[model samples]
Target: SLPKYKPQVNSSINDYICKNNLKAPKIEEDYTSYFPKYAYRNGVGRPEGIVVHDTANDRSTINGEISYMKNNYQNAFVHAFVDGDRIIETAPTDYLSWGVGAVGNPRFINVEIVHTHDYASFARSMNNYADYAATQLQYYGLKPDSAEYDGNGTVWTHYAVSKYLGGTDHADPHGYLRSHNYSYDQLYDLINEKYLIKMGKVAPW
Candidate 1:
């Protein structure tokens, strides 16, 4: 019965964008099986932080990203996909997404930001991603904080999770976002400043 309420993603994010009254420029459907597959339920744990990544290339099209995510063996999936102005919900937040490998998918409400080819574009991309990620946190009910733990606390980055999983090359939105001239502190503040945590924004149980 719980999953019956999983939100009718039977329709694409494009449809939801129109219905939810969000402005989306170009909405392309991601590679969900042309056929329907039953949604899997695994409330492993409520998502506590947001994980970020780089597309690693300038594919330059939402269509391309959608195709890649649906089929990539990297097992990339996310709760939502942000393309400049649109926030596409690829999978429901409650069900586990097979997004990040080796990093227990159930505990995350994964998000994928539409990306470009060069790392040089990272600063702007990161800014967009940060703002969107922040809005998502507020949207979902997880407020940001400096706490270094998950489980209804501490909004995070891929570096933290990969490192925690004993992953060596854990650098991500971190390495790229940091190596470039972007201010990590400022970004963190942007997200934290929107903290609605105290307002019962973590798991509406």
Candidate 2:
């Protein structure tokens, strides 16, 4: 069976989007030349889920983040990077990235959202972030499932991967979101909503 959306755990950001009529930015693909293209453990085009991350560096722009990843992909790289204005695909989802730890890298499509300084920008970035996450799940024919402590589920944060899968210890995006008064449950709800909308189970707002 697939994961199901429980209820609206948090809707402040959703409400903000409704009130403001802000739509997510279109995802732009500018595949990087540095990251190695490797198949997942399950084989090519078989990612089990998506892992959410944040740039942490609040000063970096979307292009700057892409540039840095392109140059230093040996250290790490992700499938995509999202900001308030754009969602850029840095690598192919059909291949694995070095973003999360080794245990997780071969299992999930990783996305990094750029840090935003203000509330409006944060809201926009969240919109793009959730949309990108949902789109990948929908594209790969996976369900929207929040990460569990037992290492079972579809959607995950780098923090959760580190905690349960045990290859890395970096807890990101959580602190970034919390600093802006946002929570993971809230983000999960948003992702589920976006997934349903993509699946044509719910009408887009």
Candidate 3:
């Protein structure tokens, strides 16, 4: 069972449209929108968090990953797939797909990371993924904090999702990233800092 829903910190700012703003982080839209109608239900959702995942299967392309999810994960699908320097959108945030647990499926927008054993490539992917998450926080009028609603962080790992939301037992890129001396806590901080930069609250070089 997933953790019960609890309200978290409200968005710090609204009206976050990027109109000729140079400070705002650029969100990559290199996605193929393949919203499977029967696979997911269309319902309104105020996204309180972002959950991240890894494919676990290395050498998989973004197209192949989405194809597999589209075919197999009828009951479960994610909002986006982040690989390399691109993000592939599979489903919109408003729809409910069993990405995390019941708690996250309804309340959070989740993304899958394309697996890469290459440390250099993985590092590059994390940079882009952090940018992606930061933009999502801004999109929902949310501040870039790891505030929890039902789970642990506004930006959650698959492990955190399972631990707090109780869907899957997989720890995901923790082991993978640990091999590279990285952790989700570091990713959360990166996302927060990137978001502040997007809001023009801080100057990041």
- Per-candidate Cα lDDT values, in order, are 0.49, 0.86, 0.63
Decoy 2 TM-score against native: 0.93
Cα displacement (Å) at residue 96, model 3: 3.0
The sequence of per-residue lDDT tens digits that candidate 1 reaches over residues 1-205 is 1111122223232223224433223333343543222233333335656666555444556557666666763445666665454555666554566655545454555566566435423333444455556665766666666322442345555555666653324455554444444434445653443243224332211
Report residue 57 deviation for candidate 3 (angstroms). 1.2
| lDDT per residue (tens digit) for residues 1-205 in model 3 | 2232111312211111111121322444433345443222234656777887777776778789777777766566777887655666676665555677765576678788787666555655666677788888888787765633345447777787777767677777677666656766666655676677777776544
Model 2 residue pairs with clashes? none
What are the clashing pairs of model 3?
A: none
Best by TM-score: 2
Best by lDDT: 2
Which model, 1 or 3, shows the larger lDDT?
A: 3
Off by over 4 Å in 3: 1-45, 147-152
Q: Model 3 residue 198 lDDT?
A: 70
User: Which sections of candidate 2 miss by over 4 Å?
Assistant: 1-7
